[PDB]
Write an enzyme that holds these catalytic residues in place. Structure first.
Site, short mmCIF file in Angstrom:
data_model
loop_
_atom_site.label_atom_id
_atom_site.label_comp_id
_atom_site.label_asym_id
_atom_site.label_seq_id
_atom_site.Cartn_x
_atom_site.Cartn_y
_atom_site.Cartn_z
CG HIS A 18 -5.84 -1.27 -0.74
ND1 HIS A 18 -5.40 -2.58 -0.62
CD2 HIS A 18 -6.75 -1.09 0.25
CE1 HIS A 18 -6.02 -3.16 0.40
NE2 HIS A 18 -6.84 -2.28 0.95
CD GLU A 69 -10.56 -2.83 -0.93
OE1 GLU A 69 -9.45 -2.89 -0.37
OE2 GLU A 69 -11.62 -3.17 -0.35
CG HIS A 87 -5.47 15.27 -6.00
ND1 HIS A 87 -5.47 16.58 -5.59
CD2 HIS A 87 -4.18 14.85 -5.94
CE1 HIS A 87 -4.23 16.94 -5.27
NE2 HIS A 87 -3.43 15.91 -5.48
CO LIG Z 1 -1.41 16.57 -5.46
#
Ligand SMILES: [Co+2]
Length: 281
Positions: A18, A69, A87
């Site tokens: 995560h 998370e 991102h």
């Molecule tokens: Co990308």
């Protein structure tokens, strides 16, 4: 005993678990991700003694899929993302429809769906309530829709070698785009179109980015936190970075972990795979 590291990574069965990051309003983010992004809420944990609440979201069970998370600190409304964090990416077989849905629900599309600047992969970008960017990537056959964490780094070759030696990741793809003055590398543990990758981005002549206080770390499962932390320690001596939390069990919850920063200061947590599965019950 540097060859022992090479051997360790072969035998180990590492997995991206995560991304951990902080949100100003837990219910608002859960709503955005379930309604706009089509995520599931997988697990929630309130920790009143430490004044925080976690929610885990993603596209399938945490024992097989990568998750986000979310961390909500009681009273804390706002965080600073900084310039380093890139991102998260979501693969979907119909990005035009997805972007239109996001807009319909009141989400923010910052880059309309369509082929990339010279190319034909359909992408779009959305922005979440706290400001985190989500790339939407059109991909027909995806076993893991939550498919990238993108982070910016100062020296691409140093980073690649760090993730290889410290973490046993494979360099899956590398792409220099001198036209637009950037290079990317996709790192991970399985084929790129089947897994969550770490996408590392180098911008020509940029060596320094702020870490902000919003993104926290990425967690990676391992069959042995002690052996993996030794691989890390060896790698850090050569390449930069540092162990923070030494390997061992967490008090109360008991899960064995270690933590460290890479040579750019990005934080990684190693988590015993079995302890992790046990947390899910
Ligand atoms: Co990308």
């Amino acid at each position: 005993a540097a060859e022992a590291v090479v051997d360790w990574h072969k035998h180990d069965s590492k997995r991206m678990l995560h991304a951990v990051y902080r949100v100003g309003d837990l219910d608002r983010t859960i709503k955005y991700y379930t309604e706009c992004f089509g995520m599931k809420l997988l697990r929630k944990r309130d920790v009143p003694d430490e004044k925080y609440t976690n929610a885990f979201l993603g596209f399938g069970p945490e024992n097989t899929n990568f998750a986000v998370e979310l961390t909500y600190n009681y009273g804390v409304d706002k965080y600073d993302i900084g310039t380093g964090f890139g991102h998260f990416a979501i693969a979907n077989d119909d990005v035009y429809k997805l972007a239109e849905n996001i807009k319909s629900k009141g989400g923010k599309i910052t880059r309309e769906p369509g082929p990339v600047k010279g190319g034909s992969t359909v992408i779009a970008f959305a922005q979440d309530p706290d400001g985190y960017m989500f790339e939407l990537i059109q991909r027909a056959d995806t076993p893991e829709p939550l498919c990238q964490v993108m982070l910016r780094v100062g020296d691409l070759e140093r980073s690649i070698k760090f993730y290889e030696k410290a973490l046993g990741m494979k360099l899956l793809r590398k792409k220099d785009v001198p036209d637009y003055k950037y290079t990317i590398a996709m790192l991970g543990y399985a084929d790129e179109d089947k897994t969550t990758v770490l996408e590392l981005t180098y911008n020509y002549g940029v060596t320094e980015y702020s870490k902000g206080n919003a993104y926290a770390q990425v967690a990676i499962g391992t069959n042995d936190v002690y052996k993996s932390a030794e691989a890390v320690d060896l790698a850090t001596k050569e390449l930069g970075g540092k162990i923070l939390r030494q390997p061992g069990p967490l008090p109360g919850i008991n899960t064995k972990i270690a933590s460290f920063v890479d040579p750019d200061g990005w934080k990684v947590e190693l988590v015993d795979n079995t302890d992790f599965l046990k947390e899910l019950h």
